[PDB]
Structures are given as structure tokens and as C-alpha cells.
């Protein structure tokens, strides 16, 4: 199925700066109609998962607006107005456009060093 290459592998940023994680999709995530259904994700060391965008840029209910998604077809990104302690951890980007669902990736985001 469509592969999702998460990048970069590391994103050292201070809790306050803007962070933009990328994500590429083998043959784009455009369903048979011209619509893209992406699902950004984030998880800490054994904590409660958090979903940001659920299409391409719109933010899911609960997102502090600081999260923003964008991109074309075989490329996507998640810019954050400001990183917080909770934001730290590993990032991911899923997609419900193709089947079966992918769900995976892993961008390291543990503050700036």
C-alpha cells in the first residue's frame, strides 16, 4: 500500500519555537475522488495518544490550534506554533485514504539539545 516516510528523524526544538514535521506518501493520499484523509498523531513514553489534523490541515476537537497541517499529495507537514513539554515524544502520521490503513512512522521530538 501507500508507504509513509516520516521525517525528519529528529527535531530538536525549544519549548516555544515552531516545529514542522514532514511525511511523504508513496503515491499520494488522494482517494478516488480528489480528497485526502490524513491523520497526524503524537505519543509520549507510554501516555495518552493525541490526534492533531484528520485530513490535511483542519485540527481535531481538542487541538489547541497551535497545530497546523498542510502539504500536497505525496508530501505533508505539521507545523506547531510552539512546542510544549507534552509535545515532546515521538510523532507519527496516519492515513485512511487507502486500505488497509498504514499508521506508523516515528519522528523524534525531545526538545532542543
State the CATH number of the domain containing residue 37: 2.60.40.10
As a whole number of angstroms, the distance between CA 20 and CA 102 comes to 21
Report in angstroms the alpha-carbon separations of 100 from 3, 72, 80, 103: 11, 21, 29, 10
The cell 509535545 sits on which residue? 87
Count how many domains the chain has: 1
Report in angstroms the alpha-carbon separations of 26 from 6, 10, 60, 108: 12, 21, 25, 21
Q: Which domain holds residue 56?
A: 1-113
Report in angstroms the alpha-carbon separations of 33 from 7, 36, 46: 28, 9, 38
As a whole number of angstroms, the distance between CA 70 and CA 44 comes to 23
Amino acid at each position: 500500500d501507500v508507504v509513509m516516510t516520516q521525517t525528519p528523524l529528529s527535531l530538536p526544538v525549544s519549548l516555544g519555537d515552531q516545529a514542522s514535521i514532514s511525511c511523504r506518501s508513496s503515491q499520494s493520499l488522494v482517494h478516488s475522488n480528489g480528497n485526502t484523509y490524513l491523520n497526524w498523531y503524537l505519543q509520549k513514553a507510554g501516555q495518552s495518544p493525541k490526534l492533531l489534523i484528520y485530513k490535511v490541515s483542519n485540527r481535531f476537537s481538542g487541538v489547541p490550534d497551535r497545530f497546523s497541517g498542510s502539504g500536497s499529495g505525496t508530501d505533508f507537514t505539521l507545523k506547531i506554533s510552539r512546542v510544549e513539554a507534552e509535545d515532546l515524544g515521538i510523532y507519527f502520521c496516519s492515513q485512511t485514504t487507502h486500505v488497509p490503513p498504514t499508521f506508523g512512522g516515528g519522528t523524534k521530538l525531545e526538545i532542543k539539545r
